């Protein structure tokens, strides 16, 4: 019997403890997902979408163990933890209500009388790893529309917050879902690489989710493409925010603050890049310094300011390192700054180039860049000089230049005169390039995790050349 | 100046000889596909069409060289030569067809007066590795719905029939697409590694898409995960048919012989295994011997037989081995037999087990053996014995115990009382497990070519938490 633990980030004291699984032990959770499976297939439409209804209600039934879980484990607002468990019931009532729209197509054939169709089939059992920052969303969207489309599912929980991801199977486990259909993997972060390595491997296994960085998605890939196993990769993102000549100034500073630093800044698509054209960027810069200067970092345990706790105080380093290194190659801190403890404030860096570190690398904290751009062509360039590619937004005035860049940006998702942060159950969200591919939520969720069949039946004789 | 040969199988002098292009040529060709990208992704639907439709028509005019090449290079009949032009021409103006169809979705927002788009958008360059089996179906298969997306193609040549594919880029070279647009990349069989890894590699390539073997394929998605690539996978199969106690023997005996001969058994979905039910086998197993022995093997460039050569004499002695193996271990031979020349027998072994080689290796070749079944859940069992699951075909009078006994069948394709060898240009094609995964053909084909992005417009100020 082995465990590890998950340290309180405000008071430095055990937040939780969970089984340290070993590859056997995750193999073992594989076979039985890998039985259940079956039985939950055949299940019909109406019959799977009240056992995700009733998924849903146990989820808002354990609220007051999600909100001490969050805010022990990562040092989040009762607020970000109640807005996760609002919206992560919402996504499994989305999940619910697509079981009836979980089909096929009926294709004609140049085959005299053949009846030829195209069927959208559960898979087997689905790997899903969730990350930590939104832990209830996206451990719930790890799951929701796998086990909708018919599947039986592993989520492996995230170590940071071990007890927020395992309530979310305690809450499933309240559903009625057959035996084995709803996993747990917990397991110490050393072993990571040999127990996510099991459950690519594991032949039950025929989808992989995952959320992360680049660096854990390119090994997961590469361990992937072993066995031959689809993935859908939602890694980093430096998502980049324009600022046009004709953009409403006051609006693009609201977004843009907004963007920067909801929970932090530890979202993928948080904004870390704004790209300001010459015309208005020494207005914009004011009002978004004011901006940024209002917004108060305090005690997520008191409730009272926008901004609460980073996860911990690597976050703090990595952020500060960031600072030193910008402003040592010219840049000018205009909001908040360097600090001393995980309540970090709202900070603003000015001046940001191509030499510094903060330019490309994605922080995961309340820090964010302004870059300056010639003109339109310029701030087009700036956007699309990453290697990420996940959120993007464009502020401008005319809507139909905000189409005309939205189209030249490299990017899974961007959103005219909104802020990079947004999110809807029912919208396909993923990345491009080192963000990764595939897309959750909507129809292209469900291609993930179905299995499209060529099923044929023929009516007639047939007419062979030999 | 370095060139590489393909010997004629029936002659024993060079077929032909192509470029043995280095990694830095591949690069450069993938550098000219790049810039000719931009241009091509904003023709609109007709004028891309239009040149689609050229290309089918240029195609169809090369048909001279296109049955000279084949019948030299891989030993084909001009039958299957014309075959393959006719479904080749045929894929290009379906790949025309569905340029007007390739759009988007409007999705219904919770956020007011946002409009929300799911656009599918050109990626820019997608290689195409095409194999030698149906080179002109699969050259054009490798190309035709990417450049209908609006990209710009390499069509990574086969070293078994390089001038067979480099008729299909000259045919397209007709049909006025911009400079840059479709380029093709030859190499010799020992830098395959280094070509395509090149490709693979180089930043403007987007997607990819592969056809050939299950090894080949794994290193293809391995080097793939390096750079966060996407893949289209087919990797072949070992196609079972499943003959129940109440089929059509005669036309199960008929579908059985196309399947497993048509190409001399040089196709991805040839009919490798027969599962009889031991109610039926003895009279299946005769109709089906009687049927194999009535299809002779003759010279292709006589054009009188339904069976022609093989492709070279490797295959000549992996099929002697099987059938060493076989009739060894107790299997019976009840049609054709051990060949000394790439003019092989149709050939049928009665009696496989799971110890013999015949069993589960993938043979390639004209020869086919039949597996006895106690019942209909021991020859699912048996089907389904295999690492591969790209076609699969049962025969029943009750279709609705074939729609059953279909849905437990794992594989990405099932034909119920119809040959394992089918394609349709307008039906997703593609396969599970050890066959890979992806599909060409029809929406699928679409979604493979095309970058899903969620593009929005707001059309109300936006009301933020912080």
Same mark, same amino acid.
């Given at each position: 019997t082995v465990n590890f633990e998950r340290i309180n980030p405000m008071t430095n004291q055990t937040a939780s403890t969970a089984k340290a699984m070993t590859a056997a032990e995750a193999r073992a959770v594989a076979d039985?997902?890998?039985?259940?499976?079956?039985?939950?297939?055949?299940?019909?439409?109406?019959?799977?979408?009240?056992?995700?209804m009733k998924a849903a209600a146990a989820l808002e039934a354990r609220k007051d163990d999600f909100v001490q879980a969050m805010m022990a484990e990562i040092g989040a607002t009762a607020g970000w933890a109640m807005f996760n468990l609002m919206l992560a019931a919402s996504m499994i009532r989305?999940?619910?209500?697509?079981?009836?729209?979980?089909?096929?197509?009926?294709?004609?054939?140049?085959?005299?009388?053949?009846?030829?169709?195209?069927?959208?089939?559960?898979?087997?059992?689905?790997?899903?790893?969730?990350?930590?920052?939104?832990?209830?969303?996206?451990?719930?969207?790890?799951?929701?529309?796998?086990?909708?489309?018919?599947?039986?599912?592993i989520l492996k929980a995230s170590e940071i917050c071990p007890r927020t991801h395992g309530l979310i199977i305690e809450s499933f486990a309240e559903a009625?879902?057959?035996?084995?259909?709803?996993?747990?993997?917990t397991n110490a972060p050393q072993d990571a690489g040999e127990v996510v390595?099991?459950?690519?491997?594991?032949?039950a296994v025929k989808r992989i989710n995952f959320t992360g960085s680049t660096g854990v998605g390119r090994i997961i890939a590469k361990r992937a493409a072993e066995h031959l196993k689809p993935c859908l990769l939602?890694?980093?993102?430096?998502?980049?925010?324009?600022?046009?000549?004709?953009?409403?100034?006051?609006?693009?500073?609201?977004a843009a603050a907004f963007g920067a630093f909801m929970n932090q800044g530890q979202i993928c698509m948080s904004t870390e890049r704004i790209i300001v054209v010459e015309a208005i960027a020494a207005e914009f810069t004011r009002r978004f310094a004011a901006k940024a200067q209002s917004m108060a970092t305090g005690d997520p345990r008191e409730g009272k300011t926008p901004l609460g706790?980073?996860?911990?105080?690597?976050?703090?380093?990595?952020?500060?390192?960031?600072?030193?290194?910008?402003?040592?190659?010219?840049?000018?801190?205009?909001?908040?700054?360097?600090?001393d403890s995980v309540?970090?404030? %709202?900070?603003?860096?000015?001046?940001?180039? #191509? $030499?510094?570190?903060?330019? =490309? *690398?994605?922080?995961? !904290?309340?820090? &964010?860049?302004?870059?300056?751009?010639?003109?339109?062509?310029?701030?087009?360039?700036? %956007?699309?000089?990453?290697?990420?590619?996940? #959120? $993007?937004?464009?502020?401008? =005035? *005319?809507?139909?230049? !905000?189409?005309? &860049?939205?189209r030249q940006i490299r990017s899974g998702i961007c959103h005219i005169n909104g802020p990079t942060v947004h999110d809807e159950a029912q919208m396909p969200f993923?990345?491009?390039?080192?963000?990764?591919?595939?897309?959750?939520?909507?129809?292209?969720?469900?291609?993930?995790?179905?299995?499209?069949?060529?099923?044929?039946?023929?009516?007639?004789?047939?007419?062979?050349?030999?």
């Open positions: 039985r997902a890998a039985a259940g499976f079956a039985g939950w297939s055949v299940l019909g439409p109406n019959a799977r979408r009240a056992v995700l989305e999940a619910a209500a697509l079981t009836t729209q979980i089909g096929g197509e009926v294709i004609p054939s140049d085959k005299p009388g053949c009846l030829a169709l195209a069927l959208r089939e559960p898979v087997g059992v689905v790997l899903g790893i969730a990350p930590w920052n939104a832990p209830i969303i996206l451990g719930v969207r790890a799951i929701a529309v796998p086990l909708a489309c018919g599947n039986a599912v009625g879902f057959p035996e084995g259909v709803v996993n747990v993997v390595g099991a459950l690519i491997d594991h032949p939602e890694l980093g993102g430096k998502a980049p925010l324009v600022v046009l000549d004709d953009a409403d100034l006051d609006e693009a500073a609201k706790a980073v996860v911990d105080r690597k976050t703090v380093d990595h952020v500060n390192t960031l600072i030193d290194d910008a402003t040592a190659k010219g840049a000018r801190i205009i909001a908040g700054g360097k600090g309540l970090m404030s %709202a900070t603003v860096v000015d001046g940001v180039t #191509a $030499a510094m570190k903060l330019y =490309r *690398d994605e922080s995961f !904290g309340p820090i &964010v860049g302004i870059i300056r751009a010639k003109d339109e062509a310029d701030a087009v360039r700036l %956007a699309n000089d990453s290697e990420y590619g996940l #959120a $993007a937004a464009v502020f401008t =005035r *005319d809507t139909a230049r !905000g189409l005309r &860049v939205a993923g990345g491009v390039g080192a963000s990764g591919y595939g897309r959750f939520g909507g129809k292209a969720g469900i291609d993930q995790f179905t299995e499209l069949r060529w099923i044929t039946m023929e009516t007639q004789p047939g007419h062979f050349p030999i």
